Write an enzyme that holds these catalytic residues in place. Structure first.
Site, PDB file in Angstrom:
ATOM      1  N   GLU A   1       0.817  -1.210   0.000  1.00 41.53           N
ATOM      2  CA  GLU A   1       0.000   0.000   0.000  1.00 41.53           C
ATOM      3  C   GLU A   1       0.854   1.266   0.000  1.00 41.53           C
ATOM      4  OE1 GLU A   1      -3.148   0.430  -0.431  1.00 41.53           O
ATOM      5  OE2 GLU A   1      -4.062  -1.529  -0.053  1.00 41.53           O
TER       6      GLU A   1
ATOM      7  N   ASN B   1      -7.849   9.010  -5.443  1.00 38.86           N
ATOM      8  CA  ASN B   1      -8.734   8.074  -6.119  1.00 38.86           C
ATOM      9  C   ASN B   1      -9.541   8.786  -7.201  1.00 38.86           C
ATOM     10  OD1 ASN B   1      -8.003   5.966  -4.271  1.00 38.86           O
ATOM     11  ND2 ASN B   1      -9.403   6.901  -2.787  1.00 38.86           N
TER      12      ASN B   1
ATOM     13  N   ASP C   1     -12.698   9.005  -7.712  1.00 35.92           N
ATOM     14  CA  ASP C   1     -13.877   9.741  -7.272  1.00 35.92           C
ATOM     15  C   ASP C   1     -13.539  11.031  -6.531  1.00 35.92           C
ATOM     16  OD1 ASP C   1     -12.944   8.824  -4.835  1.00 35.92           O
ATOM     17  OD2 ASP C   1     -14.815   7.856  -4.237  1.00 35.92           O
TER      18      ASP C   1
ATOM     19  N   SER D   1     -11.686  11.204  -3.688  1.00 37.33           N
ATOM     20  CA  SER D   1     -11.188  10.918  -2.352  1.00 37.33           C
ATOM     21  C   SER D   1      -9.682  10.640  -2.407  1.00 37.33           C
ATOM     22  CB  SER D   1     -11.940   9.736  -1.745  1.00 37.33           C
ATOM     23  OG  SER D   1     -11.743   8.567  -2.516  1.00 37.33           O
TER      24      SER D   1
ATOM     25  N   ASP E   1      -6.288   8.521  -0.314  1.00 36.79           N
ATOM     26  CA  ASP E   1      -5.841   7.503   0.631  1.00 36.79           C
ATOM     27  C   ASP E   1      -4.612   8.017   1.366  1.00 36.79           C
ATOM     28  OD1 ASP E   1      -7.766   5.806  -0.559  1.00 36.79           O
ATOM     29  OD2 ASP E   1      -6.290   5.260  -2.097  1.00 36.79           O
TER      30      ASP E   1
ATOM     31  N   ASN F   1      -8.887   5.598   3.303  1.00 36.28           N
ATOM     32  CA  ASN F   1      -9.606   6.428   2.341  1.00 36.28           C
ATOM     33  C   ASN F   1     -10.474   7.481   3.028  1.00 36.28           C
ATOM     34  OD1 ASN F   1     -11.108   7.341   0.090  1.00 36.28           O
ATOM     35  ND2 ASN F   1     -11.250   5.286  -0.789  1.00 36.28           N
TER      36      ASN F   1
ATOM     37  N   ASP G   1     -15.534  -4.376   9.510  1.00 35.23           N
ATOM     38  CA  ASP G   1     -16.759  -3.874   8.893  1.00 35.23           C
ATOM     39  C   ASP G   1     -17.469  -4.896   8.009  1.00 35.23           C
ATOM     40  OD1 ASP G   1     -15.471  -3.985   6.377  1.00 35.23           O
ATOM     41  OD2 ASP G   1     -15.762  -1.864   5.933  1.00 35.23           O
TER      42      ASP G   1
END
Ligand code: NA
Length: 129
Positions: free
Chosen positions: A35, A46, A48, A50, A52, A59, A101
């Site tokens: 990562e 990203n 969209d 957003s 990280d 994110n 989650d």
């Protein structure tokens, strides 16, 4: 801060990630490697809009507030810049909420594509843990 492999393994173990939700420590070190290359200051945008953040590339769409992701959530109740610190506490505590989650470590695309199904224990070989 750019962590050493065993240095990060030891800090992750001390913060309770070893076998957290059944994921052995090598999974977390492997995820961090692909990562962020162990770099707490890593950022990536990203498609969209957003971003990280940090050693586990958390994110802003769901997990932190960076002031530039309108309509998003802040489920870890932190500013995203906190995830860039040399102290990995905030990253680890937020990662614990992510992995809980329902999707496990599949939330991390690099883990699914580069760690899942491999010999992840190799990432802690040689470390005094
Ligand atoms: Na957010």
């Amino acid at each position: 801060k750019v962590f050493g492999r065993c240095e990060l393994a030891a800090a992750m173990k001390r913060h309770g990630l070893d076998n957290y939700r059944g994921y052995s420590l090598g999974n977390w070190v492997c995820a961090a490697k692909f990562e962020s290359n162990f770099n707490t200051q890593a950022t990536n945008r990203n498609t969209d809009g957003s971003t990280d953040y940090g050693i586990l590339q958390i994110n802003s769409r769901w997990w932190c507030n960076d002031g530039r992701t309108p309509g998003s959530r802040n489920l870890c109740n932190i500013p995203c810049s906190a995830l860039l610190s040399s102290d990995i506490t905030a990253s680890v505590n937020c990662a614990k909420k992510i992995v809980s989650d329902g999707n496990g470590m599949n939330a991390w695309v690099a883990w699914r594509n580069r760690c899942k199904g491999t010999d992840v224990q190799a990432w802690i070989r040689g470390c005094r843990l």
